[PDB]
Design a protein around this ligand. Structure first.
Ligand SMILES: NC(=O)c1ccc[n+]([C@@H]2O[C@H](COP(=O)([O-])OP(=O)(O)OC[C@H]3O[C@@H](n4cnc5c(N)ncnc54)[C@H](OP(=O)(O)O)[C@@H]3O)[C@@H](O)[C@H]2O)c1
Length: 416
């Protein structure tokens, strides 16, 4: 419906700037496999309740599909399909041997007990086994899911398969004790920091002690701020929660800010920092801007007021296309959404490789591989930007669609 057609429109707009056949557009619009199943679980009161689960594999030309699992009561088939379609290009931009996947269950996990959550995960695996697997489809943790549900799902898959193949490789995000990989928690933030550093290098800006402003102080935002201040040595000047933001021109320490937020429930009234609104934080005179909160954070109203030279949107599509055009005409380099949060999927791919090979890498090795892959992806996007004279979002979309088209043409799926 709405999200699926929005993704289709985005794909059309992307193809407007590159040469691919019409049959390729039609093949890419329709996801290859849609699996809608009924997931029954014996509730704690003794009754049996059935939920609706969706597994959407949009494409697998480049390799086994990869996709997160969402447990949200508002989840719909169109949303899962659109997210799988986006995940296709998310894994394509990084140049991974992955296709686009997505999973979801129509359920609210707030009132589900731990036994009920375990039963839900195991029954979902029992229902979707026939269309998943280490070489076929790799589920991942996503919103309202944590590595414990991943452990339960992996255990169920291993039990059903009778331990014939690499069970640990069927899914990602598993705990470090069982098939885990290092750097998973800070994966998205680490990729974002690498992209920020690379954009600064491309623009000729050294980031020694300069201004970075993060709008949104969740796990991803806190990790991004801490990693920036540590590796890049930049001056974190503003962080905001769902309530308000705190600004200090001298700098901030993300550790103490997170401690204060945990203790008081918010970052409001932080010592040495003036309380400011989210819109004021978005319009600060900084060099790097990273929105880590609710999407559509920047619109036409405030796009013209943005002065940060580098905008790394870690959030999923937090900037409207009109605001994208406004930032483009303002001389602002804006890192696309799936070119920023791609660190999570890159480290998930690393975890999958570790699971298959039976060899687990150290923190430094995972960091090095993530750096290489993410820098190469961003540099390819920036080169296409400077070549085709098209937006960063447009360049990343063109690269991803070109890779998918080449994979499909090599497989013989499309003759032209
Ligand atoms: N490709 C992938 O594998 C993939 C895809 C999607 C998501 N993910 C990751 O997996 C996670 C799943 O999403 P999620 O929605 O479960 O995470 P989440 O809700 O974003 O985690 C914390 C969020 O809740 C808000 N928050 C923080 N402290 C709070 C408090 N005391 N009271 C109320 N709200 C508070 C924060 O908003 P403010 O920042 O505004 O304070 C923050 O954005 C995300 O964190 C994301 O990084 C991965």
């Amino acid at each position: 419906i709405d999200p699926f057609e929005m993704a289709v429109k985005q794909l059309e707009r992307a193809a407007q700037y590159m040469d691919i056949s019409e049959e390729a557009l039609e093949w890419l619009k329709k996801p290859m496999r849609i699996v809608e199943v009924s997931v029954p679980i014996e509730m704690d009161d003794g009754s049996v309740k059935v939920f609706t689960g969706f597994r959407v594999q949009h494409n697998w030309a480049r390799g086994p599909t990869k996709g997160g699992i969402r447990w949200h009561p508002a989840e719909t088939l169109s949303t899962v399909k659109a997210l799988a379609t986006w995940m296709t290009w998310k894994v394509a931009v990084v140049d991974l041997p992955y296709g686009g996947g997505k999973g979801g269950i129509i359920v609210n996990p707030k009132e589900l007990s731990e036994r009920e959550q375990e039963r839900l995960a195991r029954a979902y695996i029992r229902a979707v086994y026939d269309v998943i697997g280490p070489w076929t489809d790799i589920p991942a943790p996503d919103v309202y899911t944590n590595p414990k549900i991943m452990g339960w799902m992996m255990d169920e898959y291993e039990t059903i398969m009778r331990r014939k193949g690499p069970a640990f490789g069927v899914i990602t995000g598993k705990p470090l004790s069982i098939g885990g990989s290092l750097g998973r928690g800070t994966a998205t933030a680490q990729g974002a920091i690498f992209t920020i550093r690379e954009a600064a290098k491309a623009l000729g800006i050294d980031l020694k002690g300069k201004k970075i402003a993060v709008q949104g102080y969740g796990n991803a935002g806190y990790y991004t701020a801490k990693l920036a201040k540590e590796q890049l040595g930049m001056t974190v000047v503003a962080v905001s929660d769902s309530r308000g933001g705190i600004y200090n021109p001298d700098g901030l320490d993300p550790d103490e800010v997170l401690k204060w937020k945990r203790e008081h429930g918010s970052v409001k009234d932080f010592p040495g920092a003036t309380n400011i609104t989210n819109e004021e934080l978005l319009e600060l005179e900084v060099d790097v801007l990273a929105p880590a909160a609710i999407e559509e954070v920047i619109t036409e109203k405030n796009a013209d007021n943005i002065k940060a030279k580098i905008v790394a949107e870690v959030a999923n599509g937090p900037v409207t296309p009109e605001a994208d055009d406004i930032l483009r005409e303002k001389g602002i380099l804006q890192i696309p959404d799936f070119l920023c949060n791609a660190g999570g999927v890159t480290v998930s791919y690393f975890e999958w490789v570790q699971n298959i090979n039976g060899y687990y890498w150290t923190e430094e090795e995972v960091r090095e591989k993530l750096d290489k892959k993410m820098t190469k992806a961003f540099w390819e996007v920036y080169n296409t930007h400077k070549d085709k004279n098209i937006h960063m979002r447009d360049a990343a979309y063109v690269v991803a669609v070109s890779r998918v088209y080449q994979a499909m043409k090599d497989r013989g799926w499309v003759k032209k």
